[PDB]
Amino acid sequence: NETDFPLYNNYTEPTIAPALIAVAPIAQYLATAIGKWAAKAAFSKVLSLIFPGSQPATMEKVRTEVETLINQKLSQDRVNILNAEYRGIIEVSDVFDAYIKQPGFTPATAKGYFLNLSGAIIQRLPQFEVQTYEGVSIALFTQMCTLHLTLLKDGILAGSAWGFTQADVDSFIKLFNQKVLDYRTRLMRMYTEEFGRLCKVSLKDGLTFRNMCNLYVFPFAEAWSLMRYEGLKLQSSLSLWDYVGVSIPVNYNEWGGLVYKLLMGEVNQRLTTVKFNYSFTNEPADIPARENIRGVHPIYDPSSGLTGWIGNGRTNNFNFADNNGNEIMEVRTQTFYQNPNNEPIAPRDIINQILTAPAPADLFFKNADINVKFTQWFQSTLYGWNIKLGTQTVLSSRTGTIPPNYLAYDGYYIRAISACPRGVSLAYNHDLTTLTYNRIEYDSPTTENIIVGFAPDNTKDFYSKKSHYLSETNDSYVIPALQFAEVSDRSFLEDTPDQATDGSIKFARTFISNEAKYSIRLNTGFNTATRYKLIIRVRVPYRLPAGIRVQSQNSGNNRMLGSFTANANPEWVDFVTDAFTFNDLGITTSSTNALFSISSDSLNSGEEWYLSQLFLVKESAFTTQINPLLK
């Protein structure tokens, strides 16, 4: 607090690398099972990873890590309560785990053991859903639902071997199909509640809480929605956000209407330049020196002019900033005083300049060092800033040395650099800030904050090459909907972090059509005779008479891959196309314009639908194991 020690992503000691958190081996094995499930054997492994040695020791490691990230701490009484519920789950699972490992056991015996385990988990689940402590317990809730949903799938697959009749399995399928939805709803209920509450205090606080869920909660929620299949890929592409600066409250309606859009900029483009509006002054000789951050201007595609200033880029107000075809970079004013005795010849300084930092030769910044120092004076608080991006010192404070604030995450790079408007209403231009065809910007006298988004390394190829490259050696590919080649107008950015991506497209055009296109190229050695299938993840809350249509476009060769009836349903649904090969689509190793198109007709006023992600999977590696239509 009152020390000048180095910080690490705003914290006082280094943070655990995202790949070394206590839930990481549980996620790693989950991804393996999504691609190939080992019947009547996966609940055991998941049991040994969540409760190693029949001990709750790992689950307490998870609690302590979460408590440190969000600066919330459970009381010693609440801790005694959770551990008691862990041991109850352990005992019942020890009985069941032990019995299936006995070769030649009695199937009807395990049936009763199976049922006892399921009810014991269902019974203790509400203990992790108390609203007063949901900021911490949401991570614990996720592991418990994960253990239960795994038990149901194993039971469904190994039916009679565990003493289940065909009416038993049919009962479990209905139970699974309902609880995979109910568990998602209950988790999202806790996340939106605590996030909305924390943002109203401060956006920095709400981002810090969101950074935790991205690592501990949302990757598993996505996994839940893939467990009914075998052969798809589990991959998260959620970004981590570092907020440096003052406190700015934000309602939840303001987060989704304006703020998130300003942070993302051009969601399918890499950053090539960012600029900063900087102020320095010490004109009253008594008051100490001060600095101000007035605006932030990230530039993505240099040919789009989509993103504008957040804050303001006005360096003066005496006349202009363009005129003669040249931008004004720095205005400096000096003033001099003098008296015979005790000469106050200390010349004051006023500085207003735009600071430019081009993207490096490596296309992306790997890390940064940005910090702000507060200084109190009567009723006023002053500011001093330090900026560094990559190896480029942008700003060294003129008010005094400021300790470092190392912003970095192993396995992540910097994609977006934005800021949040300060001192103005965040209620305007929501319905006008679309993905394209509008000026993504907001005016403000200052921002006094800088926000940095770290994207996972699995996204580096797309933001470098502007296309998705398919290999022969992989079986499944995930395509986040925001990694599009082009999109139609009157479409928005929707925050859907439960999908384990950085967002979804909400279409809302009432003329022509709604369309999103994705660029596909083939690496050499690709087998064009292999059969593939395509899965489309959408949500259709209003009826679409003409439906949704997936199509291949390869120069002159256009082909329909699937046309799907779109009935109204407020949950996420999956559409699977027939099989095809790449030779049918005419796509080769030299093809440079091949696109996948997902499209619908125009909509009515007040209607909308959502695109989340695409799944490309070899026909041999894919199966539907739990029919979703059996509710």
Added chain:
Amino acid sequence: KDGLTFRNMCNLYVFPFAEAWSLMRYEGLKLQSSLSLWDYVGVSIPVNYNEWGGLVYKLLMGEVNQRLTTVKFNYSFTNEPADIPARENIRGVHPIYDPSSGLTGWIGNGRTNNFNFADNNGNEIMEVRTQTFYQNPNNEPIAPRDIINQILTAPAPADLFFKNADINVKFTQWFQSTLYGWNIKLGTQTVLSSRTGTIPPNYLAYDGYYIRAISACPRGVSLAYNHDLTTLTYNRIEYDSPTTENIIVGFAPDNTKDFYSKKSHYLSETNDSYVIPALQFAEVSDRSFLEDTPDQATDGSIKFARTFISNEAKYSIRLNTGFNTATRYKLIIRVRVPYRLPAGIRVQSQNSGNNRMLGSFTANANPEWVDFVTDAFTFNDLGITTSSTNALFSISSDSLNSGEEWYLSQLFLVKESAFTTQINPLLK
């Protein structure tokens, strides 16, 4: 002003016939001009020819496939030195087309002050007025001076379009200085009555034409920048300047009123031939520009120049009741391909889920305009009915190389029975 006056003449006496020349080899197409007439009111501003096609024409057209819904004016009045007479200034012009696109910005400037802001509290500042008072016992100069800076708003009428206007400017010399006084009227709405004295009328109107665009030309600044950045879409069509001191009005012919009202092309049974200017598109791809091709007897052509994804323009087509869907039709495409396109140019029908290829044409290099004719088809084949609301015609090509480009001019839809090629163009 002088160059527009000369261009207005050619539009009426020269260019309609040049287009006719390029249809004489056929029998069955339609001769129709859609060139606009431009009224320039204000001071003298020189402009090179490279500046006309790189920036100025684009600023005049705004959103080339949209109708105007609002235009705003930045107005200045002052008589602060009591000796010098009153003066007025036009500082900026902001035409708004699609209210959801934010494509067009100020030409000139919309800054009414510089003491602080113009937004902040979610409300735009409309008028700043400053008064000042003096006094002396004998010969009291109690005449209070006035300084006025305000934004003037004129919404598009209930008839969707203004039919005429009355705008004029009065010059007054004073030592080495020339002063200005302005009068503005649009339709039946008096926007500005001059505070310097009565100004005679200047009736702007052409029988058979209506007002589509209201723009202006930047004054006192270089017109050399942002040419390669001012595309049809995906960029901010604007230019900063201390004043404009001019207003430019474009009158479009009445044969264009249906498209700018309905946003679609309606086909009738009783007609034989239809012309579709390329700028009357439903949507267009990025990195495409406005090209002045007045010899085509239209208001311009699309120059495609995208080096990724694809180059595509789409056109909206609806059917009036009584249309015979069993009639056979053909489609003619007027393009210019100065560089080779290996994968060619492709015409396609898109009607909800029903997409069909109407023609795929070899694109060899040739610096003259060429015509591509598709095979015959019927509208029943394309699945299009009287209730269809999303049917589109797509003309597309692949991505291009750096420095390459091709041009789209117009489309011709003609009944197969009414059309013949009478002079083979391949016999050179």
Added chain:
Amino acid sequence: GNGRTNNFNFADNNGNEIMEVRTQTFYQNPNNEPIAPRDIINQILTAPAPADLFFKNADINVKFTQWFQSTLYGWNIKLGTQTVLSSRTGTIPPNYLAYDGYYIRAI
């Protein structure tokens, strides 16, 4: 104090003193129209000595108004029978300045 009514240029120049500078500004929105036009006023107020050579009494008072950390002001000025300033912020109670057997010499 200071008699500067502005800082855009001058106060003399053409042989005449500048008495009042008033600035108005106008805003507008379709719904809940904030058409309340703001006002900025800077003026020099003159009060000549009466025909009786001296003012006998006066009525001058100031009203304080608190707002967050800020205190605002409103003034009322009267000399003799001449109302110099009536407050634009609201009514301010009188403050009778007078002493029997005394007159006003200095202000």
